[PDB]
């Protein structure tokens, strides 16, 4: 496609990586010749490999968020099969001596098929998770899914669940109002910049404004007394949040930093040694190749 008289470069780049990755040969060679590279970013194909990765993180003083990967869920049957995978994860984490935290996307529980289905399946996950001390994060997907995601969060909180948190994205205009609307829930928040392609009508097109909004929302949340997980790799933002929290006397027990597994691992450890709570987000599952393709196909 074209944008403003010139080829859409974002589109061109995405389409090339997707075409190249989809070629049977390059996939064959990535699986065979690039095993070490892949395992820096994805634990493995199995729950067993994920747990070993979490143990290896914990030995270095960094906590784990376990993220089950799966093919895009398109039928009720697939949503139930994915929930099954989530339940095995919850049951497997149950004994572990370290903090237990899983992440999931509501579309994988059939949100697009039925909001009622997603809620039913999610509630069954929380029923297992909460007595086991397993925290469940509802990852935030693209803008058309925000209202439903917030609805399901409020529903579960109102049914008595507390071991559940949400993600807010600093690139959306609507996020400050969402945050303010949610305050009576005293939500546990993960703050991210935002990973989806959104039109200028719903999201700041300017990286300076996305970054400014991230800092504004983080500081607002901190001053409101909310527990906030700063999910960012941006050194400017990390340095400012460290300075701000120290200046404001905000205890280390009231916030944390989160990084993708294998991204700035040296900084993950440094922040850990400085006394901050740090987690790495650890994907695992049979669908790692399409997943890594999409991460590459982004920026």
Ligand X SMILES: *N1=C2C(=O)[N]C(=O)N=C2N([C][C]([O])[C]([O])[C]([O])[C]OP([O])(=O)OP([O])(=O)O[C][C]2O[C](N3[C]=NC4=C3N=[C]N=C4[N])[C]([O])[C]2[O])C2=[C]C([C])=C([C])[C]=C21
Q: Which does 176 bind (CB under 5 to 8 A by kind): its own copies, ligand X, none?
A: its own copies
Does position 260 interact with ligand X (CB under 6 A)? The reply is: yes
Binding mask 192-231 for its own copies (x = CB under 8 A): --------------x-xx-xxx-xx--xx--x--------
Q: How many residues bind its own copies (CB under 8 A)?
A: 20
* One of 44, 110, 165, 194 touching ligand X (CB under 6 A): 194
Please report how close the Cβ of residue 109 comes to its own copies at its closest, in angstroms.
Answer: 31
Please report how close the Cβ of residue 182 comes to ligand X at its closest, in angstroms.
Answer: 16
Q: Which residues contact 166 (CB under 8 A, 6 or more apart)?
A: 137, 138, 140, 149, 150, 153, 182, 187, 188, 189, 190
Per the annotation, where are the binding residues for FAD?
140, 169, 193-195, 207, 232-233
Could you list the residues that contact ligand X (CB under 6 A)? 139-140, 167, 169, 192-196, 231-235, 258-260, 263-264, 281, 298-299
Per the annotation, where are the binding residues for substrate?
105, 294-295
Could you list the residues that contact its own copies (CB under 8 A)? 173, 176-177, 180, 206, 208-209, 211-213, 215-216, 219-220, 223, 236, 240, 243, 247-248
């Amino acid at each position: 496609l074209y944008f403003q008289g010139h080829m859409n470069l974002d589109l061109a780049y995405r389409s090339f990586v997707l075409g190249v990755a989809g070629h049977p040969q390059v996939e064959r060679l990535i699986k065979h010749r690039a095993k070490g590279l892949v395992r820096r970013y994805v634990a493995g194909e199995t729950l067993e490999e994920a747990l070993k990765a979490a143990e290896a993180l914990e030995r270095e003083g960094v906590h784990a968020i376990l993220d089950l990967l799966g093919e895009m869920v398109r039928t009720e049957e697939e949503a139930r099969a994915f929930q099954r995978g989530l339940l095995e994860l919850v049951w497997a984490l149950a004994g572990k001596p370290w903090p237990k935290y899983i992440s999931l996307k509501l579309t994988q529980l059939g949100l697009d098929l039925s909001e009622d289905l997603a809620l039913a399946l999610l509630r069954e996950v929380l029923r297992e998770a909460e007595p086991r001390g397993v925290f469940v994060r509802l990852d935030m997907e693209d803008s058309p899914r925000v209202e439903a995601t917030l609805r399901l969060y409020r529903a579960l909180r109102e049914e008595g669940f507390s071991q559940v948190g949400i993600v807010l994205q600093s690139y959306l205009y609507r996020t400050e109002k969402d945050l303010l609307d949610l305050l009576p829930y005293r939500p546990n928040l993960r703050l991210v910049k935002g990973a989806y392609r959104e039109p200028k009508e719903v999201a700041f097109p300017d990286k300076r404004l996305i970054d400014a909004e991230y800092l504004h929302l983080g500081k607002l949340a901190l001053k409101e007394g909310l527990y906030v997980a700063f999910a960012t790799h941006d050194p400017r933002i990390i340095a400012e949040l460290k300075r701000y929290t120290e200046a404001m006397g905000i205890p280390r027990s009231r916030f944390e930093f989160q990084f993708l597994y294998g991204v700035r691992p040296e900084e993950q450890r440094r922040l850990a040694r400085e006394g901050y709570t740090v987690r790495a987000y650890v994907p695992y599952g049979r669908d790692w190749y399409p997943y890594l393709t999409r991460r590459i196909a982004e920026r």
